[PDB]
Design a protein around this ligand. Structure first.
Ligand code: MET
Length: 518
């Protein structure tokens, strides 16, 4: 069933300036988006800011400025940061947007009409930093920035507070079975698997109803009013989760401004999300509440939620490190160094190690070998002669690479997709070392034709599959190889031999990735 591939990042709270956490989440969103564009699919990637709520209002009162001003300013910083990082996100959404508020009111009303929202009370703990209702088993003793004995969350370690309010409640308990049916029927719907097992055991243990409104005094009136009850506001999370639905209904122009809000989501072919990218800290909201809301309203459910191991909500400034080591290099490192854990070190030591060892020595050196005037004397893709069994063993790897990488990208597991490409790059280097084409120019020109061609095609296919990870460097690489534009995109060009012999190399000026001191 052909649709627009819809991939999202979380929308980030604007209480604080952007940092690595948001960058990483949005990078993963971007890379997925980019891969599906390379595949030749229609894409809509979405990122944004979560601007309402008690936490943002209190962050604004701290800086002593009006919530409206504060949110607009920080949202501007988020846009500036994502432009600087050179992402390719299709739209940046803000929950302050009037069209978003409209959607939230439609959704609220639907849920209320379906009989799934009732007037009740919430009496219990709450973390204002996490905007999360917690049960007594999720709290314990700690300290506030005062150094005073207070209660704190087990999840996050943020300070908790008792809440006792008459609140609109969502009948989440009613969706326990349907959610379990969903998890079991679609065993890939939550990645990675151990996070899937967590959600299941949680929902198995039973679900309480969820407070979806709060007394307007509590939130300092910085939130969306409940339809037909201006004393209550919509829970920042029902507000925030609904962005995905809103994004799927916005027509967007050349510039990137929202220009229209279609009534029916089907009109734009985006909903539901194919991949929701999130951090592990917000799994419950995306894997439990969000699908229950959609079930209540009769909306389609997302296909995949992927939860990585950072926290969405000693310094590491990504814009700064990118200026030092290069943008693509940094992205690669972040994507390669870490899978589904915090573990893996992000030090300058290991950062330089990967730059020099993989990007420069493995990829960079290989690109210079197959384009060198010394080795490639004609500056063109040569026509291969007969293939040895060794030739054919490398070709087999190059041919198998796209299918393997495709699966990894789709899981999605971007680390394993990188590892798989680089395994082929390591192979090509070994092959080149064995064949020693520098010697062959003098000894056996017919043999060189064959070696060089395989090497070039290996470099091209690896580079194509790495183009979502190294979007600027892939282009430079292709420019060196003289690969025509049409051959830089599309599944047709995952195939071995897509670029014909006689294709001329691009001119020289020039090192691809420069190495650095330890
Ligand atoms: C619907 S995504 C909401 C995520 C939350 N605002 C955060 O910053 O972590």
């Amino acid at each position: 069933v052909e649709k627009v591939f819809f991939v999202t990042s979380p929308i980030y709270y604007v209480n604080a300036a952007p940092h690595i956490g948001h960058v990483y989440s949005t990078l993963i969103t971007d890379v997925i988006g980019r891969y599906h564009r390379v595949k030749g699919e229609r894409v809509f990637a979405l990122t944004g800011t979560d601007e309402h709520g008690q936490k943002v209002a209190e962050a604004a009162k701290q800086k002593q400025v009006s919530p409206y001003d504060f949110t607009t300013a920080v949202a501007g910083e988020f846009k500036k940061c994502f432009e600087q990082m050179d992402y390719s996100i299709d739209y940046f959404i803000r929950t302050t947007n009037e069209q978003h508020k409209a959607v939230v009111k439609e959704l609220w009303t639907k849920l209320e009409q379906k009989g799934d929202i009732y007037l009740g009370r919430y009496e219990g703990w709450y973390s204002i930093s996490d905007e999360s209702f917690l049960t007594p088993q999720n709290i314990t003793d700690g300290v506030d920035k005062d150094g005073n004995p207070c209660k704190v969350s087990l999840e996050s370690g943020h300070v908790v507070t008792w809440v006792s309010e008459e609140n609109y409640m969502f009948r989440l308990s009613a969706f326990r079975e349907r959610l379990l049916e969903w998890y079991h029927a679609n065993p890939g719907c939550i990645v990675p698997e151990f996070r899937r097992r967590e959600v299941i055991r949680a929902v198995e243990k039973g679900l309480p109803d969820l407070s979806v409104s709060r007394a307007r005094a509590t939130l300092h009136n910085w939130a969306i009013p409940v339809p037909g009850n201006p004393d209550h506001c919509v829970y920042v999370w029902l507000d925030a989760l609904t962005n995905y639905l809103t994004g799927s209904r916005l027509r967007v122009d050349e510039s990137g401004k929202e220009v229209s809000l279609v009534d029916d989501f089907n009109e734009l072919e985006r909903f539901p999300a194919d991949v929701h990218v999130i951090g592990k800290d917000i799994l419950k909201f995306h894997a439990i509440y969000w699908p229950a809301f959609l079930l209540s309203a009769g909306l389609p459910l997302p296909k995949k939620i992927v939860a990585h191991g950072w926290w969405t909500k000693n310094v590491f400034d990504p814009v700064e490190k990118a200026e030092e080591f290069g943008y693509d290099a940094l992205k690669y490192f972040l994507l390669r160094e870490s899978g589904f854990s915090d573990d893996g070190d992000y030090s300058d030591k290991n950062m330089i190690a990967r730059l020099n060892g993989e990007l420069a020595d493995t990829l960079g050196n290989l690109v210079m070998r197959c384009t060198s005037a010394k080795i490639n004397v004609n500056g063109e893709w040569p026509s291969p002669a007969a293939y040895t069994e060794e030739d054919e063993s490398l070709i087999q790897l190059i041919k198998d690479l796209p299918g393997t990488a495709d699966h990894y990208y789709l899981i999605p597991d971007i680390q394993k997709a990188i590892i798989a490409v680089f395994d082929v790059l390591r192979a090509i280097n070994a092959y080149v070392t064995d064949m020693a084409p520098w010697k062959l120019v003098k000894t056996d020109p017919e043999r060189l034709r064959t070696v060089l061609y395989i090497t070039l095609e290996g470099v091209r296919v690896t580079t194509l599959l790495l183009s979502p990870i190294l979007p600027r460097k892939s282009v430079v690489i292709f420019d060196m190889l003289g690969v025509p534009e049409v051959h830089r995109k599309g599944i047709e060009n995952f195939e071995f031999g897509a670029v014909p012999p006689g294709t001329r190399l691009g001119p020289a000026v020039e090192v691809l990735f420069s190495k650095r001191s330890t």
